[PDB]
Amino acid sequence: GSVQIVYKPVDLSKVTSKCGSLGNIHHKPGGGQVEVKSEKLDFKDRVQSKIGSLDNITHVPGGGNKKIETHKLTFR
Amino acid sequence: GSVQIVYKPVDLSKVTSKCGSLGNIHHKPGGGQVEVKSEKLDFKDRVQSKIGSLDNITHVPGGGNKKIETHKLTFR
Amino acid sequence: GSVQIVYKPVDLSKVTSKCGSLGNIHHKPGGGQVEVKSEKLDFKDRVQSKIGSLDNITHVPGGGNKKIETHKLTFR
Amino acid sequence: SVQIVYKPVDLSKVTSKCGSLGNIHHKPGGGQVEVKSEKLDFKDRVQSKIGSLDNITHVPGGGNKKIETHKLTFR
Amino acid sequence: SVQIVYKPVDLSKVTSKCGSLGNIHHKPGGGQVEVKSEKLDFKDRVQSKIGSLDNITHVPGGGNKKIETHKLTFR
Amino acid sequence: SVQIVYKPVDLSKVTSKCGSLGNIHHKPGGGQVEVKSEKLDFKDRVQSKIGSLDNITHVPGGGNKKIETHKLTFR
């Protein structure tokens, strides 16, 4: 027999912001004092090692708003 | 017999922000003193090691609003 | 016999912030003193290790509003 | 056969925070002022100030001294 | 046969923060001033100031001294 | 047969932050000033100032001294 599928989601979303000012953002991390002492360091497969390292991100978008949509129709 | 599926969700969502000001944000972490003493360090499969390291994020979106929708129709 | 499914949820929702000012936010963690003494450090399958390290996030959205929807229809 | 290791670590923080600093919505409000002066005689030095609001932060203090003397004498 | 290692580490932080600094929505408001002067006689030096608002940040202070002396004498 | 390793490490920070700095929405406001003068006699030096707002940042202070002296004497 007949199968009829009418997939028509309707989207009039508003995702919005107003910011009067962004400013005076100070990302100033400071490293310490670090010592590693050994007869050997022995690192093998997919070892990740950070010694006294800095990983720094400053992210300051004026909006930074997101709208994520997934639409799926599976007929089987 | 006949199967009829009508999928029409209606969406007039509002996600909104007003901010008069963002500022004076101070991300200033400080490392200490770290000592590792050994005869060996011996790291194998998928070891993750951080010694005295700083991983630092400042995220300051003026809005930062999110909307997420998943729509699924499965006919089986 | 005939099957009819009508899926039409209607959404007019409002998610909203008003803020006069965000500011004077001070993320300033300090490390101490850490000592690890050994004959060996010996790490294998998916060991995660942190000695005297800092993981630091400041997240300061002017809005930061979220809306999440899942719509699912399963015919089987 | 002597070994000497002289390795002091100074991670120290010295800080002064003086005056106003972290204030939010500070709103000092001077009222109306009126001065009416008639027939005043001054026979010596005059110093005068008139006004609605003095909003002063004055900091002759604060500020820092670090002194650290390091000496190694082997002899 | 002597070994001397002289390796002091100075990571030290010395900070002065003096005056106004991190204020948010500071709104000092001087109201109305009126001065009416009639028939005043001054027979010596006059110093006069008139005004609605003195908004002042004045810092003779703050500022820093680091003195750090390092001496190694072997002899 | 003597070994001397003189290697002091300076990573130190000396900072002065004096005056106004990181203010947000600082809005000083002087209201109306009126001065009316009649028949005033001055027989010596006059100093006068009139105005709605003085908005002064004045920093004779701040400033830094670093003095670090290194001496290695073997003899």
UniProtKB/Swiss-Prot annotation, chains A, B, C:
The modification N6-acetyllysine is found at residues 8, 14, 18, 28, 40, 44, 66. Phosphorylation at serine and threonine residues in S-P or T-P motifs by proline-directed protein kinases (PDPK1, CDK1, CDK5, GSK3, MAPK) (only 2-3 sites per protein in interphase, seven-fold increase in mitosis, and in the form associated with paired helical filaments (PHF-tau)), and at serine residues in K-X-G-S motifs by MAP/microtubule affinity-regulating kinase (MARK1, MARK2, MARK3 or MARK4), causing detachment from microtubules, and their disassembly. Phosphorylation decreases with age. Polyubiquitinated. Requires functional TRAF6 and may provoke SQSTM1-dependent degradation by the proteasome. PHF-tau can be modified by three different forms of polyubiquitination. 'Lys-48'-linked polyubiquitination is the major form, 'Lys-6'-linked and 'Lys-11'-linked polyubiquitination also occur. There is a cross-link at residues 8, 14, 18, 28, 40, 44, 50, 66, 72 (Glycyl lysine isopeptide (Lys-Gly) (interchain with G-Cter in ubiquitin)). Changing residue 49 to L: In fatal respiratory hypoventilation; unusual apparent autosomal recessive inheritance; reduced binding to microtubules as well as increased fibrillization and aggregation. The record marks 8, 14, 18, 28, 37, 40, 67, 72 as: Not glycated. Changing residue 17 to F: In PIDB; markedly reduced ability of tau to promote microtubule assembly. Changing residue 34 to M: In FTD1; ultrastructural and biochemical characteristics indistinguishable from Alzheimer disease; accelerates aggregation of tau into filaments. Tau/MAP repeats lie at residues 3-33, 34-65. It comes from the Eukaryota. Glycans are attached at residues 44, 50, 66. The modification Omega-N-methylarginine is found at residue 46. Coiled coil: none annotated. The modification Phosphoserine is found at residues 2, 21, 49, 53. Expressed in neurons. Isoform PNS-tau is expressed in the peripheral nervous system while the others are expressed in the central nervous system. It is found in: Cytoplasm, Cytosol; Cell membrane; Cytoplasm, Cytoskeleton; Cell projection, Axon. The modification N6,N6-dimethyllysine is found at residue 8. The tau/MAP repeat binds to tubulin. Type I isoforms contain 3 repeats while type II isoforms contain 4 repeats. Interacts with MARK1, MARK2, MARK3 and MARK4. Interacts with PSMC2 through SQSTM1. Interacts with SQSTM1 when polyubiquitinated. Interacts with FKBP4. Binds to CSNK1D. Interacts with SGK1. Interacts with PIN1. Interacts with LRRK2. Interacts with LRP1, leading to endocytosis; this interaction is reduced in the presence of LRPAP1/RAP. Promotes microtubule assembly and stability, and might be involved in the establishment and maintenance of neuronal polarity. The C-terminus binds axonal microtubules while the N-terminus binds neural plasma membrane components, suggesting that tau functions as a linker protein between both. Axonal polarity is predetermined by TAU/MAPT localization (in the neuronal cell) in the domain of the cell body defined by the centrosome. The short isoforms allow plasticity of the cytoskeleton whereas the longer isoforms may preferentially play a role in its stabilization. It is linked to In Alzheimer disease, the neuronal cytoskeleton in the brain is progressively disrupted and replaced by tangles of paired helical filaments (PHF) and straight filaments, mainly composed of hyperphosphorylated forms of TAU (PHF-TAU or AD P-TAU). O-GlcNAcylation is greatly reduced in Alzheimer disease brain cerebral cortex leading to an increase in TAU/MAPT phosphorylations. Frontotemporal dementia 1: A form of dementia characterized by pathologic finding of frontotemporal lobar degeneration, presenile dementia with behavioral changes, deterioration of cognitive capacities and loss of memory. In some cases, parkinsonian symptoms are prominent. Neuropathological changes include frontotemporal atrophy often associated with atrophy of the basal ganglia, substantia nigra, amygdala. In most cases, protein tau deposits are found in glial cells and/or neurons. This is Microtubule-associated protein tau. It comes from Homo sapiens (Human). The gene is MAPT. The chain holds residues 621 to 696 of 758 of the full protein.
